[PDB]
Amino acid sequence: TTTLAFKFLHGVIVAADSRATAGAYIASQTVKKVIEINPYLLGTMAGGAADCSFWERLLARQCRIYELRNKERISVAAASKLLANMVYQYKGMGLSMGTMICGWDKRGPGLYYVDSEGNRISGTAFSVGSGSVYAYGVMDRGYSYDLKVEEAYDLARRAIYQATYRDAYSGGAVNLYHVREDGWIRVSSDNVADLHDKYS
Amino acid sequence: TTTLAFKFLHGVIVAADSRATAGAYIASQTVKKVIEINPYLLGTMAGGAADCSFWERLLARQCRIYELRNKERISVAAASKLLANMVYQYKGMGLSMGTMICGWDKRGPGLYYVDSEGNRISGTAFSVGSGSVYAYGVMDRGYSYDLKVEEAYDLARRAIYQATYRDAYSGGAVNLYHVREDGWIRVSSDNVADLHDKYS
Amino acid sequence: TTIAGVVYKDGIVLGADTRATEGMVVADKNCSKIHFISPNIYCCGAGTAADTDMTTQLISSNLELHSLTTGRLPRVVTANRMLKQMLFRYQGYIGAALVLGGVDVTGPHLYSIYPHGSTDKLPYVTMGSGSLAAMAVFEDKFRPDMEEEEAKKLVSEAIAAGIFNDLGSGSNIDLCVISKSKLDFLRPFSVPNKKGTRLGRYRCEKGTTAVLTEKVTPLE
Amino acid sequence: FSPYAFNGGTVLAIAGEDFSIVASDTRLSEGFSIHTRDSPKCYKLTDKTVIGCSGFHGDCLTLTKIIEARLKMYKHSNNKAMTTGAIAAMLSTILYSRRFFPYYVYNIIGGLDEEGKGAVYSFDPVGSYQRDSFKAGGSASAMLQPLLDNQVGFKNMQNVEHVPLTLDRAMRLVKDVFISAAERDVYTGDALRICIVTKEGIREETVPLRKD
Amino acid sequence: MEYLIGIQGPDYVLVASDRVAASNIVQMKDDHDKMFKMSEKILLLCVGEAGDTVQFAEYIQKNVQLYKMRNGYELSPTAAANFTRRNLADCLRSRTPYHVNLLLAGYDEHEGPALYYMDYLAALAKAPFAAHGYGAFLTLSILDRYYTPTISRERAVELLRKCLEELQKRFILNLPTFSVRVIDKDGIHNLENIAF
Amino acid sequence: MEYLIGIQGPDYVLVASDRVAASNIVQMKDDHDKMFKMSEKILLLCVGEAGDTVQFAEYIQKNVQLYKMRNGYELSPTAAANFTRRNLADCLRSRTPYHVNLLLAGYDEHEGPALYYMDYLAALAKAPFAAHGYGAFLTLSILDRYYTPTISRERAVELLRKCLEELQKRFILNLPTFSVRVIDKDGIHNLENIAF
Amino acid sequence: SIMSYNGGAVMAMKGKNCVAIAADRRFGIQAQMVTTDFQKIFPMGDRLYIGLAGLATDVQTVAQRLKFRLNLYELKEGRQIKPYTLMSMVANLLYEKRFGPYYTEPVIAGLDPKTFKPFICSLDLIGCPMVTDDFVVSGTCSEQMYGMCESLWEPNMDPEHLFETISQAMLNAVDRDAVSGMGVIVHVIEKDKITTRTLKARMD
Amino acid sequence: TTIMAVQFNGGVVLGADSRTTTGSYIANRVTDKLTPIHDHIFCCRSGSAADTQAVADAVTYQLGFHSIELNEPPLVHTAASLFKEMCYRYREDLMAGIIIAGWDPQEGGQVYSVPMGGMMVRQSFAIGGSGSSYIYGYVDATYREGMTKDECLQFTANALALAMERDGSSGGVIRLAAIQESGVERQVLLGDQIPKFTIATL
Amino acid sequence: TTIMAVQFNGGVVLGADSRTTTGSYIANRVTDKLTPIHDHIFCCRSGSAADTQAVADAVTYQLGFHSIELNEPPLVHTAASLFKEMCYRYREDLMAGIIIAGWDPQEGGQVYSVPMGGMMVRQSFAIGGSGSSYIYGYVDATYREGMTKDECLQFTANALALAMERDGSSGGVIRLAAIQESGVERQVLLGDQIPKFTIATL
Amino acid sequence: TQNPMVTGTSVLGVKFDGGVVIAADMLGSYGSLARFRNISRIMRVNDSTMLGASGDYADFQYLKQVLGQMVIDEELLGDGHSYSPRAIHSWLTRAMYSRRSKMNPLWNTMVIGGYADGESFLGYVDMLGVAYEAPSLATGYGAYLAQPLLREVLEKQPVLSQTEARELVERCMRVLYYRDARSYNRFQIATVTEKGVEIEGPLSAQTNWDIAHM
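Output (structure tokens, whole complex):
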């Protein structure tokens, strides 16, 4: 798994692969690693499939209840804190989940990284998964805060594609998202094989 | 144990403590951690008392035989290589010895660090032992290549004294040596308690 | 693996399954477990396949040398002695459970050799993963001094029991009838398992595979 | 004392335009012995939902009873039958309830959705699931999957018509891959039970496989 | 490993810490804050286990803020350092022990500046200067040789630079930026970040 | 962890490595050389266990030098890379196995530049570019995205800088200086050390 | 597992009067790919090839030692080695390290030097030969290769038909395996020619 | 496994079970645990089937070669000495409890016990194997001095039968042997011949 | 430890050893392993001294309270049922093999064996403890139906003595007990009274 | 329990035309020693049900007393509703699984034989909670030694008569005595038909030892 997210001048760009692996056998090549918490909030998954899926779904339920009680949407900082407090109770039990909570609230575009270990840090460019080390290299080498929307898409796409080329547990298709003031939008979903013929 | 050696513009300065410890009980407060291989070669000891003592003595015997065969003294690089090849045969057996081979040959003042692990590096300022981390700080902060002989003595002395103050397995007296073109000379041997009243 | 053998009225009848598995997957569907030691002596093999093959290849090569020297027909005790002395010396590291059976001057002899070096001389033996199933058939139907056809029937039933009850056994049933005047190696003697016929044809048509590079090298 | 046991088995699911197929072998084993040659791994949930369970038979039986009870409770409080998607969602949470002492079962739910189209949901022991076109689980899951990717999804094929999968053609494929799986997988054999789910109820079939 | 350092002067207490948040072998963050404001003149520096530090540091912060809310006045540096030692010591033999190493810096109007050192086993010790982490072994002797009780604020910062410079030339870990703060009678001040 | 990197161009092969020699938590050396000259146009980069690297690297060096001495000509990059793979593979199941990871760079007059990658299990692989260590995970994708077979010598050095710059901003380890060499028809050249 | 450390997969298929041998090209340590053109199939004669899957270091070692013995064998008794004789030579070589063997499972494919009769076999790590009349696989994705081979293989296949069958088999098998892939190379051995082509495979 | 050897005036009486098991499965139910070392020297075997067979083979090879060079019938004590030497020398590997029993012209009927460690002790009667634990109290209360050859045969059969009924590793048939100056008298006690003892019922 | 209980017409006969050891040291050489549960209900104890003493105490407290409420002499089977319940319920902790034996007006003399697991089986005679392994073959060949009270006392003493001589954990003196409709007849067999059996000599 | 103490061996079970027959030896083993030689391992649940158990004997007695009290409670109501063999088999499965989920299993492998509404029932319930039905069952060592023989006879003759099943069960006991070291030569035989449950024995098999000489 390879998930990456970076916030430039026009919101947050979220990309990920779609490969699921059970040991050395490829279980799936079309898995969804991005969770649509709500219209303005996104969540990425990496590590334990069942873990991520379940706690992100529980987070979504809490966010929905939060909005009904106070008649307002939850912030990215508050949402990530909820997820951090949630998984902290089972710390050391074996939970395996690395997620990136992205959105746009009152403080602008927000990007937070939360894992099962207990970490909850805010930043501008993150990468989770086994292929995250490879994505970092490509991302950082072409990352700029003034990057144009089209340029930001190509960067994220290329970063994920290079990670699937080196990491054995990464592959499939690159699903891309774009978080804006009006909400997130599904940018594209290109297969890695089709990207290979375009980058070569 | 705390041993340090650095080569400035006037040769090499070698200092060490004199404490031996068997667990938590102080076995001795007057142990010699510097070995006089020959008139122009010195060797420091750290780690296994019996190990260092034995292999350094074996190194001295080899150096003496080397000089009789070729009618010339062995270089610092050749001497340290002999010690490195010696202890490499028992690699992983449990040998514990960190030594600093210092001298003055055809290439000027030479300082080499050799351990039981397999390392054999040449340098300008080394520190071995459990109190070596503390000596590094003080040494590096006042180390200069243009340092005067008197200034070099005070630096080495102070470096060792501060290491005995923080490290529980270091103490006793500071024995200092000075390697020159004419050979090494025993500079001084001041007790740590007497240095405490001078530095305060 | 299911190997078995019985001593009938005038000879020895050996039998075994033909399936070879690597873990819990069938690697070989038609493997040969009955090994030739000499013209009058054969050996069935279980346990480690590589060990059984190399061990029987050595003993048979040693017996051939011995048979050339003396100029006489090899005995089953000789083979039994060589195998047990070798297996005991490897302290069970050469996992080779064999069912040795042949006919010499002292009549038909059946032996069962275990990996550690112990040997037994019985009228009927079974070995392998499905040895218990074959034994159950031998414990309920074996009669002393049976006819050649009756021994072939009982042995076939024994092998079949292990084939349909043990997951490590399968495929066909190979037999080996050894007597004082002949040696019939029936491979196979029975094909109780048949693969279902394909309901469709997934024949890969020419041009279905995309090729990047191709090179042709003519030969002489 | 180990609370788990591998009883073998292999469930196959295939989604169509107006149908759904859930097939599996009927052999139940333990170690290297065969318990029974007549043990279907397909369970009819509703009239358009069928579930396949392979793995620890002990967990298969308990999970199957829990699901059945949950479907009845949902109908009592909501006055309607549970849909395939709802059952898949509910099963996910049931599997995650025992996250620290999980069910050793490979679930596969194959039924019809609200639009009458074939729906297939594959599951993971702790609850992770997703909808797919086809899916294989069990001891021969890695033997059949590749063939389905090729024959159903047309992967690695150039000039090919990509003709829609029909019930007739799907039936042939299912029987063919199970015949090949019985030749290599030692846990698959005896018989093959096929459950066809269309708009006119669920139909059941049975094909004999290798006995050894 | 994270790095903490505190230096107490005549009427001020200077503290600093690394700004690196690392996962496995990569620095995920280069501007992470390890200092927690407990009150107007109290700073809590926390390092250690992944989720333990923030979880523990925020609990102590909330309680110290609550104290002022219902009482009117703030907890003193000494009282705050004892309150946090008690809490940490109560979890030691409990079900969920906090693996956190920390430094408590503050300034009391009647007691002056104060620097507290607390390890993961909850042993409170007052000191003129202290450090935490693997980099404390390479900088404690530097402080020992140059620290004097009457050290000025300008000299304290110069002394801190020497320690931080030692880490750049001797530590195997990469700690490029450091957060520098100072607490005195006026409160907590944010000094320029020391980078290399 | 030590870092090695090699980049093969049209008629040259560029190599680089860190100059840090570390013990426990301190950098004992900041100008350590990890490159061993095997012949006039062959360079051996070795990293790994404490005494294993030098012990193994020097043995191979002596034998390659011996070869030229008694034969007149030098061993080619391919032959030298196979000779060292054989030696390393012969100790694998032996009493004293060498835990060394290495890169072999050289230039043959008839075969051109060559870059070999050999892991600790002695598996020889020819490549256009390769890296060793924990920093190879953060720089292999950078090479992948920018490397082109016709890359010039000036562009190769620029590409190398990007990789080395990535380590300064993402690696947890401190690797400030790097040794940079290049092998072509003229032989081995010592390029300016890249420091930060 | 030691055998899945580098990954890889080899295949061999029997046709009418020809044989085919295919293998993946990926070379990598654990989950990291190093190169994408690692040789796994080695020519042991004009019409005799051997595929080797398993530990990369042992793959090269066994391939180099086999060539050493094969070369001496051909010089001693001036004649090309027969397919079946090469299988015995390999088995012997593998069984020599009975207790601490090479971690590679070879696959032999070729035609006899005087009758050109297709021959395929596969041995285990300790040298247990197994001749078949259809196909033989070896690697990390052996379970996937069996599934593809069992349902696609047909008796008496011509060179063109045989190539397509082994291509689809390997292609679909390595796509379901994480540590195998990065390209497929196929060798179709005929009586007068050897066709070698690389396939258009996924690179993830 | 249950082996027993008793001595009388003429010679000795050996007896054993015939069960060879591997866990809970009987590999051989008609095993012959009484091996002839020489014309009048036998040995019961217990412990490991491959260990005791290799040891019995070696001793038999050495004793026969020794008997040919001396041109004399081997003594029973010499056979016990050869077993003892091998069992002590390789006491870490071998897992064998041998009972050596026989008759010679110099000492008559002798029974030597050579247990697992490799020591060697002469007794008037000995019992070994896993099933011997159940019959220690019976052979203690039932054995008397002055038993005849026929009385030793009954006493041995009675003891082996009692052990076979209680031990899971013992069973099958009873193989007895009588060694004298004459020769050997082998005999098997099958199913109904096996001495029976009623089971306490309510 | 060696305990034994046999039943006859009138009632039962209990007997045991008196050795309490800790490794190779005898802590108590005159231990009383026969505990009275009620007037005519006794119990032999084997296994853990603290486990069996706590279990015997609990049963004795419950059986006496139960006997007072019912206003009737408790049945032997009820005492066995109470021991069985405790030994099964706490089978993971307790390490006790109890033999319950006694007499009641409804069923006469009964012996119940309650081994380590916590099962409960009625027998005509039972033996437990570590030393019982050596006397299985003797009690099988020596016990006959129709034994009298005096014959059961001799048979029990003979068996316990044979086990005491072979077991390292058994020894001391033999404590017998006869339970009947009348009452209990306790008796100790010291040094010379202990039945002797000659040792095979050469 | 975690460590089984006194255990019984395999239990045979076969269905015939109008009933089920179950056989099991009367021996409780303590390790490799045959301690209790006269215990019954087969019980009568009710008029149509009977149960056989192998493994820990103490766990079987607890289950026998719990099951027995259930039948009494159900018969005390007298409402024309009695437990069928399938309902007893179902209850056992749930009980076995519940105990295995709490990591405190009842070390038993049960065989349930019954006859209700003109249909013979043969269920199997192991300690892990693995339950299934079959024409012929065999637990413990019977699965490797008796199942092969029983299955061979039910392949040619799916429907057997009382006499055929009874004599086929005696052939299995004879083989078990020959090859199972934890078995006894004294077994019991329970049969269930429309007339109810009938426990026969103590029976013995006729062995042959002609191979001892040859």
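Chain E has one domain: 1-196.
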